[PDB]
Every structure is written in structure tokens, then in C-alpha cells.
């Protein structure tokens, strides 16, 4: 069949599927407080597992794991205003939720209020946090980062609350759940999978806070500010009520008693064998666990995952759809703690997954509104996102998703808090991640309010919306399989690489003060350009009939993304090796970021570090070239 | 054509090729003191380059490199006996040769004599070297190691001499050239290629001595012993004359003044495109540089490389030989400094070479005698070495190389001083390395006596011998190409892996005192066994006609070797990642080696280190499995 056929079919199938029902079903008390590694969790897990079997799809299995999660200890966590003694005031609050992996301790002192988790940026404010508890709004960044910065400035204890402007929740007595891990997955098995607790049981601090972090209810926040002299700025796009510092007369004490708890995570798979490259998959994932009922955080996703798996299998058996490459749906777990489920899976194929999975889609938080349509992905999927947004019509507006007034669409970078991030920044798998987002992030998200009710009360046509999301997700899959040529934009990296070279030339002056020639970099960038030009050529000259010559090419394409992972840094030390989207000194952006400091004439610039950064970042790119072909044995022997 | 045909052809071609002539030609003053990066060097380089062109073989190019080599400074290096003041006797000697990368310094003190470069083992002798110069025989290990150990015991300065028993050289006034780098290639570009000196110019100590090392003439050794009280043991399979310690009355002073010198290494390639898998090569290398005339150290090799390249090209054009996979001959340079030439090439494809080169043969020191036939390689080439030694007849004895009385032949491990070692321990390419060796190593080897004359004066039928070497090398190539199935013994690793598990079970007691379950290891070992069993099956069921299904399999085979390189250690830190043949704490052998210390009840055993060693070494193997198939997504979801 041809695209139109698959497009048309997939549509009518989408035209007759009740997503709202399943989003509800995944709310019955049978599996509501489906916390990570809970019974409910395990319940839905087996539900999905069976549904897959019922869907009559090919092989479907389970993925067991024992990771250390953190939970609220029998002892109550609390915030209390008190002086250099005598715990005055009422018990401000015994928080209902908590920030996982938070430092298990209790301390007291001054209480500064650094708008939006310091943002690392916001820390450049008047009042110093040098040895004092800090308050921050849940927003621009992740708790992990909020805390991280707080501690980088020598603070202690951090409280996170949902202000009224940012979080228009009627109830101010509401509490939410936190993370706090500056990473992805179990914080004790970095790069390599976990075992038992009995075996390999380190405690923590392996990229974990070391500073108590507690989520606080707006109501509680109110009271805190009540005992603060300072006055909240207008710079902060907020609204009245908050202060900046507690009234000298007295301070506050934070006491968090949480405990680690080894749980058994259960990832559930299920594939749809392909017909020509049966061993090249398209991983389609969806977080299945959640703190509250997480109808949004986890419902819609798993909802789509199921309904989406139900369709393709059907299309394959009844409609004649013959995916040239297999599809593999996966419902991760323990996701509220850093994709711990999906990550430790990846941790499992540390150097071969890219030889298997060529693209990772992600349905998490797919439906949260009806205004915008944010999209984050690897440039390799840029043209797919584009051409697809040109085929899918908004659920509310009768118009197409793609803004016809541009030629350059907006694509966002993947964040530390997205199951897709690990797939791309750690496993080297290109990954997309769409969202029918809103200018303001869903409020009930990390709280017990993520009910199917308050959701649909806030998004009436949730069915049509989810449908659209399930459509863009569907086309991605049909597209990434329908044809014999693996369609990934390995070109977009030429651009991505040139942009780097450019931004780097803005320091050609600094580069000159230092003996650096910066010539080897251009060579790589070029030695790589040719590589892509050949591939881009060989394809054209090859026939979509020589299963052999095509396979040899698609494999090269399939190498592109992975090979941009610094082969000079250990996963055990710095898991996000991707020079472009990773995190670490190996990061390409990190290079410039250090060089920028050169001008500051201070010591902030580590020259020896740069020297290497450049040196390796060069060979990384170079290698990416020699690996992406050049007909092997690249013969630019001159230079 | 069929094997017999190729075997028969290759033979008559070998029957009519004068190897002795070329071994001589590569001795004319046109290129005699062909030191690394010298003019002569560059002369022969262009000779080979052109010869290849003349051979009418396909593409042939050059490989430029700028590495830092160490040379003898204008100031004379010397050893002199002197009391707690001034030289009483005489300046023992002003050594004619030197040990490269040796610490540039000068010190004096006591002089102990630890037979055979301490061997690391021999250091467990009576007299302590705690702060004193040491003497050692050139033998069982490499200078690098000899020195390394000396310094690990806090010694200073090391003298290396060629005793009479081990080195039956008539002349005792003879001096030889050394190495001293505990690694491979330029000691400042570990894992990543080098540049200019102007750019990236660190000094050293990046895996280098830090202790002066000087080669000494037997004559000089005589004199040293002359001023020593101690008496040489019989344990030392040596002969009279040497002492153990200098006569208390006085000590010795070592002064080495060497300087670094950036040179331009020139690797010369040349391939023979294949007909079905044109992009899968069989790298055939041969060191081209040498200190002295190195007729043995470098002559025979390059001699073979050329003559051997001359044949296959001919066979392809005239005889109809259609190698299914391309062959690529390479004459490295700067090899006397740790394969600096070949290594920095590999350094260049840090994560893709294995996708290209599937086996590395090495012709260095191929002919050194006519008694034995030592052979070192990766178990993956075990059956090839075997079946071939069953086809090649000894040059002297009319009988076949293979000892018909056994079913298990002897294969040696690759040493830090063999260009083949890096290919296997760093790039993950299986590599063989034969030698028509002798019970005693060639004496003139590292000295100005490595002439084509003294060679042929010591090996009369050098032609026939070289021919044989050229034959086993030839068959390896024909064999690794002739057929469509990539013939590598990926099974032999099951054994190699079981042997580990076995040796490890001898400590099940220790493993028990520690909470360790050691169960995950067996799973890996097994999860891998199946992997091979499928591959070993899929092959049989596939037809040597489906270029596609075969290519998909051969590629899996081609992954086997590489995937045993710890993906948890950085090449920049520990270049030899191969868990089996590498060097480092990631090494499988290194694991047991630490565990053995457990019983010693002392602190010598680092428990935290072990815990990880095992933990990772497990996932390394595990991964090797998940990468070698299991039909992808290995479904041993239970456990």
C-alpha cells in the first residue's frame, strides 16, 4: 500500500477509537495510586501486558528491575518557623508530599526566596544564600536543578511551592510530589544496570542533593512569607504576597525524614515484527507509573500506547500494512524518579541499542491543552515532524498543525526530565517528543489532583485532542517504516555542526592568543560533510530493490546519531555523552561556555580544560565522519 | 576458483619469488639507518608507496602524523662508578644507544641487580631496591615493564644489558636501542590522534618512566659487577661473572640527557577492493622503520609486505582470484617507539575500525630462525592458525608445521610490544602474529648488527624460510576472503569465558563471605552462549547466495571481538579496554588477580574495587551477549 492508503486508513481507525474511555479506565480504583513499584502499578502493568497479548501482536514480554526509590518515612516531614531556640509559631505544615532522593536530614536557618528554583541564573540576586534555607517556585527548571544550584551556592534545605500566578489552582492546601535527582534512573547504577540490594548496595550522593528538599503547599508558603521582612520584586513575573527574606527576628527549620525502598520495577514490551528489516525497531514508549492518579502524567500516555498498539497490529493483520521494520511498544515504570524504568533498560544495551532501535517516540504528557503544539526532537527527525504537522489537523481548530507562514519551524531541545532524553543523550537514539501543550504548564501535574475528572473539566474534547496526538505519533511510525529507505535527516547535522564552527569563530581572537590553530576542526566538519554527501548520493544511485545495498546504507544512517556521543568519556562517569545534547565538559556547547569566560580576564577560564575540550571534540566529530563512510579509509591523506 | 586452486596458485607464485633479494635491497645505503622519521625512512616509504603503485593495485595512499619521539641529546649519556664523592675508577661507559622516552635526569646511588627486568616477579628477592639504581637483563619482559616495576618499588635509574648466556654475541662492546613506554604509540595522544607541537604540546609522564633508563654494553656490565660484593644466584638461569650488589665501598651514578624531537611519521597504505563486501578489510601490516639497519626488525617484514602485496594483486588480475572482501596492506613507521605509526592510525577510528577491518595480520619479525614456529593471536583466529599449519610445510624440515600428536595446539598471548596488540587490545580487531622463532631471541635485534649479512650468515636458507612465512600469511588472507562466510571462531570465546567462570569459582568461598551472589555472571555467560548458538545456527540455515542474510550475519560475527572491550573505561585513560587481553583494572584477569589477595588477610585486597570489577565485568559480558544477537531484545525477562 502507499502512504495515502496508510494515512487514510490510520485516520478512520483513529476516527473510531475511544481514547477518553481508556484514560478513564486507567483511573478506576483498580489502579489509581499507581505509585512506582506499587501493587496498583503492577496491576496496570499486567493489564497492558495482557492487552498486548489480546491485541494479538507478536512477541510481548516483561522487563524486571530492582532499583532503589525513596519514600516518606513513618516519621513526619515538616517545616516550622523558629528562632535561635523556642520553636514559635504554629506547625506551619507537615507536607503531604515529598521530594524523592532528597538528603535525609534536618536543619534550620535563614530563609531566602530565589524566584523559580534559582534558575542558576536568578541566583545572581542581592541577598546571599551563603548558609541559609531557600524557597523557590516550581517552574522554568527541574527540582533537581533548582536544588543543585541552591547547594552550589552553599545553601541548605530548599522548599518548592506552586504560586498562584503560575499555578492557578483554587485549592491552596494542595501538595505535590518531587524528584531531586540531577540525572536519569536509579542514582546508583550510572551507565550499568542494577542488581539486588543484597548485592551492590551503595547509599547515595552519587549525583544526589546532599541538601534536604521539601515540597510545600501554597498555603504554607503564604505563612512563611508572613514571617518575612523583604519584599518580592516585579522583575519576578509573579504577583504580590511573597517576601525575599524572613524577618530577622526569627528563622525556619526544615526536617525531612525519607527512606530508601528497593522496589521491583516492571517494564512491559510487545513488538510487531517487520517484513524486510525485522531487526530494526522503532521504540514507542509511555510512562506507566505515577504519584497521584496521574491521569495526565501517566494516563493519556499509556492510554495512547495501548490504543496505538491496538491499531498497528490490526492494520498489519486485517488491512495489509507491511511495516518494513518492526515496531516495539513499551510502557516504562518508576518514571517519576527519572525514567528509572526506561533508563535502566537502555543501561542494558550500552553499546548495541543503536544497532537495534533507530528512533524513539514518546507519548508521555501528550495531551495537556489545546492551544500550542510544542515539539522536541533530534534534528534527525526534523523533516518528519514538519511534513507530519502538515498532515495532521488540530483537534479544536479545523486547520493543520503546521504554521504555513514559516519555512523554519521551532523544535525544542530534550530536557533531563524526558524519557526521550536518555534515549538520545545516552543511547544515541534519535527521539521525538510532542505535546499539545499550553502557555502555562498543567498545574495538577505533580499532585493528587491529576484526576481524569479535573482534566476533562479542563479540556472538554480530550478525546479529539488525544486522537490528534495519537495521529502524529501514528504517522511517525508509519513513516519510519512504510518505505525501504530509512528516512532520517542526517544532513541537518551538517548545519548543526556549522553553527558550532560559526559561534566558535567569534572567539578566533582568543583562539589566536593561544597557539591553537583550530584548523583540524574545520577539516573534521568537512571530512564529515563529504561523508554525508556520499551517503546522500549512494542512496540515489541504489535501487529500492537491492535489499542488500540498501541495508548497507540504512545502517550507515543508523550510525549517525550514536557516533556523536563522545567516545572519550565513560558512561559510568558522564552518562549523557552526546556532544550536542548531552551534559558534561565533553558537551560541544560546554566548550564555548568555557571559552566565553576567557574574556572575563579572571581565572574562571580553565585553559588546560579547553585545550582538551577542543582537541577531543574535534576527534569526536572527525570520528563521526570516518564512521559515516567516506567509503571507508577516508583518503584525505594530504593535510 | 576453489581453495585448492588458490592454495596451489599461491604456492607456485611463492615458488618463484626472491625474498632474499628484497631483504637485501632494503639494506642498501639508500635506506639503511632508517630511523623513525629520518630521510632514509622517508626514502623506503616512498619506495613502498611506488612499488604498490607499480603493483597496479587499486587505491594506495599516505598517512601523515606528527608524534614526539625521544633522541640522544648532544650531551653524552654515561654511567660512572663513584663513591660518596667523585669517580675513583673510570666512567664505566658513554653508552652508544639509549632507551627512548626515558626520564631525562641524572642520579647516583647503590646498584642492585634484579635478574630479567625484575619481571615484577623477581622483585621478590632478598636485597631491597628501596632507593637505589638497578641492573636488569634484556629478556622475559619489555624495558617498559622492567622499568615500571623498578620504579613501583621506589628505585631510580635502570640499566639494561645483554648477558652472554641469553645473548651469545661474540662482541661485548655492542650497544642496543630501547623503548621504555608502558603503552603503544606517541605517549601524549592516548586514544585520540596527535597534532603539531605548536598545538597540544604537553611534556610527558603520561604513562612514561619518570626514572632514567639506560642501555649498557655487556663489557660495561662486566666492569659494574667488577665493583660489586654480592654474588649472582644459580636460580637465575644465567652463568658466572655477575654480582647482586655493588661493593659498599662505593656506588654508581647514571646520567641520561635525552631530548624530545617532533618528527613526521609516514604510514603507507594500498588496498585490493573486494567483489562482494568491498568495504570489509583484512589489514596486513609491517613495521618499516628501525634504529639500526634492522634487516630482521624491519627488513623481512617490509620485504614480505611488498612481495605479498605483489602476489595478490597479480592473482586478482591475471589468475582470476576474486577476494570477496578487500585486502589492505600497510607499512607503519615509528614502530620502534611502540607502534606509534600503526597505533595513532587506530587512534583515528576509535569507534568504527571494527566496522571496517575484521582481522589484522602482522609480518613483523616473521623470520628469526628455523627451529620453532611461535604463533600469537586472538582465539577468533585459532582454527585458521591450526588448519593452516596443517597446509604449510616447514622450510627446512620437509614436514608440516602442525604437530600431529596434539588436538590442542599452543597459541601465545599478544604482548605490549607487538603492533598486533593494539589492533586487538585497543581497536577490538582480532589479530594473528606468527614467527619462525627460536628458543633464544635474535641477539642483534635492537642493535646496529641487524644486518642482512649477519642474518643470512645465521640463517642460510633465509629465502625458503621467508617464503613459508609469506605462505602462512598468504593463506590467512586467501582464507579470510575466499569464501562468503566470515570465518572467525566466535565460539572459542565461550570456552574463554567458561575458563574465567571456572577460575573464579575457586574463590566461591571469598565470594560468599562477601554478600556477592555471582549469579548474574553465569546468566551473562549463558545469555552469551545462546547468542553464539543462534548465530552458529542462523548461518547454517542461511544460503551462501542471499548476499543480504549473509551480510547481516557476518556483521554480527564482526562485532564479537570488539564488544569484549569494557564500555565503561575511557580510551583516553585506559586504551587497552579488551576485558580479556587488555591491561587495567577492567581486565578480566585483573579481577581474579585482586581477589587472590583476599586470602592474604591483609589490606592488599581492595573490596570496593572488586565489587565493581565483578559488577561491570559482568555487564560487559552481558552486553557482549545482547549485542551478538539473541534475535535482539533478548527475552530472558524472568530471572
Curated annotation (Swiss-Prot), chains A, B:
It is a single-pass type II membrane protein. Residues 102-192 form the PA domain. Its main location: membrane. It comes from the Eukaryota. GO terms for cellular component: basolateral plasma membrane; blood microparticle; cell surface; clathrin-coated endocytic vesicle membrane; clathrin-coated pit; cytoplasmic vesicle; early endosome; endosome. Changing residue 523 to A: No significant effect on binding to transferrin nor HFE. Stearoylated by ZDHHC6 which inhibits TFRC-mediated activation of the JNK pathway and promotes mitochondrial fragmentation. Stearoylation does not affect iron uptake. N- and O-glycosylated, phosphorylated and palmitoylated. The serum form is only glycosylated. Keywords: Cell membrane, Disease variant, Disulfide bond, Endocytosis, Glycoprotein, Host cell receptor for virus entry, Host-virus interaction, Lipoprotein, Membrane, Palmitate, Phosphoprotein, Receptor, Secreted, Signal-anchor, Transducer, Transmembrane, Transmembrane helix. GO terms for molecular function: double-stranded RNA binding; Hsp70 protein binding; identical protein binding; protein homodimerization activity; protein kinase binding; protein-containing complex binding; RNA binding; transferrin receptor activity. Belongs to the peptidase M28 family. M28B subfamily. Changing residue 508 to A: >5-fold reduced affinity for transferrin. >10-fold reduced affinity for HFE. A motif (Cell attachment site) lies at residues 525-527. It is linked to Immunodeficiency 46: An autosomal recessive primary immunodeficiency disorder characterized by early-onset chronic diarrhea, recurrent infections, hypo- or agammaglobulinemia, normal lymphocyte counts, intermittent neutropenia, and intermittent thrombocytopenia. The chain holds residues 122 to 760 of 760 of the full protein. Residues 1-639 are extracellular. Serum transferrin receptor (sTfR) is used as a means of detecting erythropoietin (EPO) misuse by athletes and as a diagnostic test for anemia resulting from a number of conditions including rheumatoid arthritis, pregnancy, irritable bowel syndrome and in HIV patients. Canine and feline parvoviruses bind human and feline transferrin receptors and use these receptors to enter and infect cells. Residues 448-639 are annotated as: Ligand-binding. Homodimer; disulfide-linked. Binds one transferrin or HFE molecule per subunit. Binds the HLA class II histocompatibility antigen, DR1. Interacts with SH3BP3. Interacts with STEAP3; facilitates TFRC endocytosis in erythroid precursor cells. Interacts with GRM2. (Microbial infection) Interacts with Guanarito, Junin and Machupo arenavirus glycoprotein complex. This is Transferrin receptor protein 1. Cellular uptake of iron occurs via receptor-mediated endocytosis of ligand-occupied transferrin receptor into specialized endosomes. Endosomal acidification leads to iron release. The apotransferrin-receptor complex is then recycled to the cell surface with a return to neutral pH and the concomitant loss of affinity of apotransferrin for its receptor. Transferrin receptor is necessary for development of erythrocytes and the nervous system. A second ligand, the hereditary hemochromatosis protein HFE, competes for binding with transferrin for an overlapping C-terminal binding site. (Microbial infection) Acts as a receptor for new-world arenaviruses: Guanarito, Junin and Machupo virus. Glycans are attached at residues 130, 196, 606. GO terms for biological process: acute-phase response; cellular response to leukemia inhibitory factor; cellular response to xenobiotic stimulus; intracellular iron ion homeostasis; intracellular signal transduction; iron ion transport; multicellular organismal-level iron ion homeostasis; negative regulation of apoptotic process. The keyword DNA repair does not apply. It is found in: Cell membrane; Melanosome.
Amino acid at each position: 500500500l502507499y502512504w495515502d492508503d496508510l494515512k487514510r486508513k490510520l485516520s478512520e481507525k483513529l476516527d473510531s477509537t475511544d481514547f477518553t474511555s481508556t484514560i478513564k479506565l486507567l483511573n478506576e480504583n483498580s489502579y489509581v495510586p499507581r505509585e512506582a513499584g506499587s501493587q496498583k502499578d503492577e496491576n496496570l502493568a499486567l493489564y497492558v501486558e495482557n492487552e498486548f497479548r489480546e491485541f494479538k501482536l507478536s512477541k510481548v514480554w516483561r522487563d524486571q528491575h530492582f532499583v532503589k526509590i525513596q519514600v516518606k518515612d513513618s516519621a513526619q516531614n515538616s517545616v516550622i518557623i523558629v528562632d535561635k531556640n523556642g520553636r514559635l509559631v504554629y506547625l506551619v505544615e507537615n507536607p503531604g508530599g515529598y521530594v524523592a532522593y532528597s538528603k535525609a536530614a534536618t536543619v534550620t536557618g535563614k530563609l531566602v526566596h530565589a524566584n523559580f528554583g534559582t534558575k542558576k541564573d536568578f541566583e545572581d540576586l542581592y541577598t546571599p544564600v551563603n548558609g541559609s534555607i531557600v524557597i523557590v517556585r516550581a517552574g522554568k527548571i527541574t527540582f533537581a536543578e533548582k536544588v543543585a544550584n541552591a547547594e552550589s551556592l552553599n545553601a541548605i534545605g530548599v522548599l518548592i511551592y506552586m504560586d498562584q500566578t503560575k499555578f492557578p489552582i483554587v485549592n491552596a492546601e494542595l501538595s505535590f510530589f518531587g524528584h531531586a535527582h540531577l540525572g536519569t534512573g536509579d542514582p546508583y547504577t550510572p551507565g550499568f544496570p542494577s542488581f539486588n540490594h543484597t548485592q551492590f548496595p551503595p547509599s547515595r550522593s552519587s549525583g544526589l542533593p546532599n541538601i534536604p528538599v521539601q515540597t510545600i503547599s501554597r498555603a504554607a508558603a503564604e505563612k512563611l512569607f508572613g514571617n518575612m521582612e523583604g519584599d518580592c520584586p516585579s522583575d519576578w513575573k509573579t504577583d504580590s504576597t511573597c517576601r525575599m527574606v524572613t524577618s530577622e527576628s526569627k528563622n525556619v527549620k526544615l526536617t525531612v525524614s525519607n527512606v530508601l525502598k528497593e522496589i521491583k520495577i516492571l517494564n512491559i514490551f510487545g513488538v510487531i515484527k517487520g517484513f524486510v528489516e525485522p531487526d530494526h525497531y522503532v521504540v514507542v514508549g509511555a510512562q506507566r507509573d505515577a504519584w497521584g492518579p496521574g491521569a495526565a502524567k501517566s494516563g493519556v500516555g499509556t492510554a495512547l500506547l495501548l490504543k496505538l498498539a491496538q491499531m498497528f497490529s490490526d492494520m498489519v493483520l486485517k488491512d495489509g500494512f507491511q511495516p518494513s521494520r518492526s515496531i516495539i511498544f513499551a510502557s516504562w515504570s518508576a518514571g517519576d524518579f527519572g525514567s528509572v524504568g526506561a533508563t535502566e533498560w537502555l543501561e542494558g544495551y550500552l553499546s548495541s541499542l543503536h544497532l537495534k532501535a533507530f528512533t524513539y517516540i514518546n507519548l508521555d504528557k501528550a495531551v495537556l491543552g489545546t492551544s500550542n503544539f510544542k515539539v522536541s526532537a533530534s534534528p534527525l527527525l526534523y523533516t518528519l515532524i514538519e511534513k507530519t504537522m502538515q498532515n495532521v489537523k488540530h483537534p479544536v481548530t479545523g486547520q493543520f498543525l503546521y504554521q504555513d507562514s514559516n519555512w523554519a519551524s521551532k523544535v525544542e531541545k530534550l530536557t533531563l526530565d524526558n524519557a526521550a532524553f536518555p534515549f538520545l543523550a545516552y543511547s544515541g537514539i534519535p527521539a521525538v517528543s510532542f505535546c499539545f501543550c499550553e502557555d502555562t504548564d498543567y498545574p495538577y501535574l505533580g499532585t493528587t489532583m491529576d484526576t481524569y475528572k479535573e482534566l476533562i473539566e479542563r479540556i472538554p474534547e480530550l478525546n479529539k485532542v488525544a486522537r490528534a496526538a495519537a495521529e502524529v505519533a501514528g504517522q511517525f511510525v508509519i513513516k519510519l517504516t512504510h518505505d525501504v529507505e530509512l528516512n532520517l535527516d542526517y544532513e541537518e547535522y551538517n548545519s548543526q555542526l556549522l553553527s558550532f564552527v560559526r559561534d566558535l569563530n567569534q572567539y578566533r581572537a582568543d583562539i589566536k592568543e593561544m597557539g591553537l590553530s583550530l584548523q583540524w576542526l574545520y577539516s573534521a566538519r568537512g571530512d564529515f560533510f563529504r561523508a554525508t554527501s556520499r551517503l546522500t548520493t549512494d542512496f540515489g544511485n541504489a535501487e529500492k530493490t537491492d535489499r542488500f545495498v540498501m541495508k548497507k546504507l540504512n545502517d550507515r544512517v543508523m550510525r549517525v546519531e550514536y557516533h556523536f556521543l563522545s567516545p572519550y568519556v565513560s558512561p559510568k562517569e558522564s552518562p549523557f555523552r552526546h556532544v550536542f545534547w548531552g551534559s558534561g565538559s565533553h558537551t560541544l556547547p560546554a566548550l564555548l561556555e568555557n571559552l566565553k569566560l576567557r574574556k572575563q580576564n579572571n581565572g574562571a577560564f580553565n585553559e588546560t580544560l579547553f585545550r582538551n575540550q577542543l582537541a577531543l571534540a574535534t576527534w569526536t566529530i572527525q570520528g563521526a565522519a570516518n564512521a559515516l563512510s567516506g567509503d571507508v579509509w577516508d583518503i584525505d591523506n594530504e593535510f
